[model samples]
Target: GTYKNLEEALRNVFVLKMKGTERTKLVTLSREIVRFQNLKELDLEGNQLKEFPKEIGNLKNLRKLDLSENPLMFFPKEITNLESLEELNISGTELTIIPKEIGNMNGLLRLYLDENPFSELPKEIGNLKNVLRLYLSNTFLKTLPKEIGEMQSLEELNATGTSLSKLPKEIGNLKNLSNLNLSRTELTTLPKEIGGLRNVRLLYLETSRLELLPKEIGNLRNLEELYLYQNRITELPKEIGNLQNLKLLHLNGNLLETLPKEIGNLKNLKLLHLSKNRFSPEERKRIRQLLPNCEIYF
Candidate 1:
């Protein structure tokens, strides 16, 4: 999994940080970069690069490239030839244009285009059928296109901070998702179709506008962790007990006053966080008996 941070994300790459012992910020890349014929990783992050040498297109052995926080307008001509590239981060630019060439890397498994000015992902993005993790932590973005479901191979989608008012229903089509981090957003609800993500294991809806959960959530038979802190949820659906695989459930900082009795069905649950909710002393005792082996925090 990508660590969602530069240092941890590139930890596997051979050591080299743009000649900047930490402060190296080049405005332009050296054509010499393409000379490393067998290079597998390259870090040119936080530079002032508006472009790069076309020779970079021939670095077929390059597997990962970090261009985050640069001023790049687009990729080098014919970079589609970088056939071994499975991870590419062009995050942190406010640039709005995404040419079709961006989709030419059919081998991409991880793509981070965060903090961009795009309010909606371009249609061309749907061509990344092999992408497993997509990071669009764009605060300027408001909505995702229905084509999002076209990413059938997607295993994780992180929109940590956004101005979105709602999510596209097609998000339910990502059947392979194991993680869906929609934390800290303006969204108030999810489409019932979200139940379509049958293989999902971790779901994050922290600090959103959600006032309630869809009963279909019970359909996530494989879900192991659910983070719903700081929402407006007042009650849980009885179907919540259907998640027999749930191990950790976070309901702190919400408005919940009670839980469904079926919660006792979570025989495998190991930890539960319910702080700041309105559970009465008797209700707490009820939960203790329901989950005798599980640890709970009130």
Candidate 2:
């Protein structure tokens, strides 16, 4: 149901969803929304809103806010006043910049900024030390700030389809990170510090320009799924065998001619993709014999 007038809706309602309402003009939020002093969740996704009212700061109790799929070119600075906001989604918008004041929202646990036009994040982004999930996919970002390492509580980070060519060595500082996606970027080599992500379980690096893996990659003893498809890699590092817990490995669409015999050490590997690469029939046969319990695609 759509309530163009806030007075018509129940004042005590804590959640309000107005997704895909096609509201092309800015709604009078100051007059109506301010009345919902107890509101905790608000959804205005897929609207044509071009601006947010500064009076939005009055929602001191808001915990979740979704403004995705809008034409918003700039984030209203007043949003930083939402001290209690825990989850915020601003994906699929025209935003080209994020205000430094965003760091004021210390209570944020999840932040989604996918499909935005932003090329960079403010250094203050590191202030979100409590964030657990962060999405920055499909943006124009060429690099990330070293301050990103400050998000010690981060568990998942997605940065697919960006112009990023390298990551800061401080990336290894995220001791709690478990999932990382950097697919379709310009990366040619991963920093050795990447091995510091001892808790990472899943890593995505497909469709990049990588030519080799750092021996440090083997340090991810907890890694289970690894994607390195569509790169220029020629061989695997001997330390790859160190992944005793690895279950899936995608290496298709590369220049590989042979794999290290150490690969046989992946006793738990269940799936291996080796299609669209240069491999000798004898080597393929050997690979099959080495992992009789695993499914191999050539």
Candidate 3:
């Protein structure tokens, strides 16, 4: 049965979706919803809430809280102490400042702050040691604080479609990060410290408009997928061969004239896309035989 109203919501004792719907609108965050005390998931998406109640944190069992699409003008420091909350989505709040107290949430596993107007995260953000996926895409953020490296458990970082030009060198300290998306930004070159991501499996460099490849790129020995499509890069560093575990490489639509002979070192590579490049017929023929077992499209 669809539990549509707070009357029915209180019957469950474990979950409450307190958002406005076609039939009703929660004009205010009703105290009755918070009184449930046993709620584990409270969804408040698309509400007209102006502020959060200070008593909202009393829901000790709340694990997932979504507050998207609200006209929230102020950050709700009230939710920071929800120790049981592991997932939080606060997108489009129209708030310019996220109070630094946010760093105190030590149990967060997935935090979504996308599509907001905030330009920077509080330095205390590193305190989210348990956060596995952090979505900051399409925000006004221009840089990640240096403290981001302290999130040792973060496995995915997506800052795509931001105005960021370069990541702090401390970014290399994310040893557990497995996927990084930096697409459609202003990045010209990756920081040399990028090589510190030894466990990364996928790196998205699609059209951050790279002109050069750092030698440090080769340090991602465990990487399985790399997309460098539509860049102005003219050559790859010899470190390309060091990606021994690579299974897929997309170098399509680049200015490359030839691949280094060391390209043959990727014995595990299964798919190589080099369409719209400068590889001559002979260069293409040589490539097929060099990695004879894989699929190559030039």
Candidate 4:
């Protein structure tokens, strides 16, 4: 029996999980699935599907759709009709562009598009006002559209391997952002408006070409984790010590020559990475004394 004919398998079943299998070629689902209005979950991972049929929108009650590890080159624009969709994972696909209508999925909470090659995000993506998590790692993105700041409900924005050199000033609009990954890019500086994220918790920015951090970073009163390894920073802003909530701080592989005395202000710091740099043993000892509560690593 074809997996597309899922209606035959839906014998009063409400949730279906058919993941991690080689069941490929989902041509079209049987019309009977349209009758199962109670269907809420659907998992079709590790398939060879090229595309989904237009009838997929008929599952108006679908809350989650996992179509990872497929050969899809593009997504159907009509999928925006899935008004009840809360999570949609299309990672590890061949997608090059996201349709503008994607913002129409008002109920979308988590959207994953990692491991693809997108040059730029659709300008309308900011219309997803209710979105929480958006993963676009390992893509070809050059910069983020300013409209992205409009996603006030966004919590995470992962751009681990993109071409972003700088973030937009509008990024301050993401007041709800808690985690952000900007590793393996060409970012030389961060937006001064970054300080607006008063609630940010985790920030990853390792292995880049940064020279200095914005002085505004001290404004994040709730920030906890910060990764800044493998860069060209000469010195940290003295205000960094003002972050009383900071816990983990990664700053290895940089061009630092000395430790700032203000670092002693972080009473809550637990982990501090300063290895693989040009600091002498004396400087390392000084840094250890400055952050007495932190476990120093080289």
Candidate 5:
């Protein structure tokens, strides 16, 4: 069946994509379309939707939904009724507030809420116990809720380009987190609890206000890459030498006058970025001697 109208579409469709269709001036989805009993995927990206239809809650079988690049002013509370939803993308929207009802979507594995204007998240966000990835980049968020620590299944979290000056101490509770991005924020310091992410492999903290890292940072035994370029950091903790698996370290564009001699312990380190610092020629020579097998940038 060609599925020309909404009625016919709902009866036979498993996937319906109307993304980037210039002719589809969707101001709101038709309430009747929520009767879709078998539909699993819906894509409405790059539309003119100002609000979502509350009737969308009736689609209990839906597993994926994309509403990115819309002009939505608020999230519809009823959307939380989609208990089968596994992936939801609402990025690049005009949203200023997320409904607390969002916590009810327990089946979600990936949630994309990046590029929104919201400055904070609801404490109820901790209810997403099954979510594996969360994207919150380019928002106005200043802090995260302590309840966020409840997401024990989370593996990836991105908060780059936010206004966060500090992370909640409870962030250490993400025991399964393997990737974290905090680049281009206002963070001046990290909590000692950050060392609890013993599984983290990649950590990005570039272009921030950091002055020093907590010695507890050395506890990330599995970390391979650490990016700290363009910060105000003056020195690294001797504990940094504990990262025996670290392969790359970026320390460029800082105020560093010297490095800890413990840095010589990174026998597996392959690249060291030390450019744009206040290192004297003698200091550069000393760094080269410390990392004879690693590529050193001055």
Candidate 6:
């Protein structure tokens, strides 16, 4: 079960999935797995292990790794040796400390660290400049490192269920950011600079304490999905019409009484969720007349 069949499998296969076994350990296959010069994916999920073999990095062609739901208490610094890795999932693990060398994964595009106890991330996280999707939800993070803004290639950041009270103005530097989740946080207001995310597609403000969005939010030209439900917002910005590409606007469960006439300018909006808001039929008619192309939900 160790060498013969494994070698034959590697010769013709590039992706391997191994998860949910009671063996409690990975042996004999460690040395032979690295020999798979064309290996691209490796799944080691649901293993009740504490650590990984340092030689796991020898798979130079490996691109994705799934080690989630394990008891690994610490991430080995050697994992950084897999420079070709692009997607990595360590969610629901016991990892509390990540090596600073983690930034060495230059080709990394997506990283999942959900449900970890990390109080803070290493400043080197900024070095993952090419990251496209980053999920750090429920990590108990209070504040992000200022260097986080240096990730110019970041496209999505999911930090829901965390304690981040303030987001750095540098967050506006993610020119390609499409989705930002700050649900269930202590954020009272967004940075005026947040309007700089002109390419943002989804904004999650669910279950937050925000009173209003910054006026600059109107500058988001490519915004499409907005999750502003369960907040204390009272009004919409007049510049709301500036979002010509908005498609889904979720404003349910808010304190909003009035919407800006500019909202009528969202010619491309498709779905509008305004459930549980106080609105007059006159205002609704006005919105319908302006955004005839949209699907509104009252």
Give lDDT for model 3.
0.84
Q: Whole-model Cα lDDT per candidate?
A: 0.79, 0.87, 0.84, 0.83, 0.87, 0.80
Clashing pairs in 6: none
Off by over 4 Å in 5: 1-12
* lDDT by residue for model 3 (1-298), tens: 1345656544564455556565555667756557566666677788778877777887778788889888888778889988768899998788687779887788999999888888888988998899999998888888889999999999999988888878899999999999999877777788899999989999998877787788988889989999999888898888889998999999988899888787899999999999999989988899888887789998
lDDT tens digits by residue: candidate 5, 108-185:
999999999997899888899999999999998989889888888889999999999898999999999998999999
**Per-residue lDDT of model 1, residues 81-109, tens digit only:** 67668898878765665555666787899
lDDT of 6 by residue, 51-142 (tens): 56667887777888887787778876667888878999988887777677888987789999888988888899989887999998888888
Instruction: Report lDDT (Cα) of residue 170, candidate 6.
Output: 85
Backbone clashes in model 5: 0
TM-score of each: 0.86, 0.94, 0.92, 0.91, 0.94, 0.86
Residue-by-residue lDDT tens digits, candidate 2, 210-290: 988998999999999999999999989999999999999999999999888888888899999999999899998998888
lDDT of 1: 0.79
Could you give me the TM-score of model 6 versus the true structure?
Answer: 0.86
Of 1 and 6, the candidate ranking higher by lDDT: 6
For model 2 the local lDDT of residue 284 reads: 89
Off by over 4 Å in 2: 1-7, 10-14, 22-30
Where is the poorest 10-residue window by lDDT in model 3? 1-10
Q: After superposition, how far is residue 103 of candidate 6 from its true place, in Å?
A: 1.2
Which ten residues in a row are the worst by lDDT in model 5?
Answer: 1-10
List clashing residue pairs in candidate 5. none
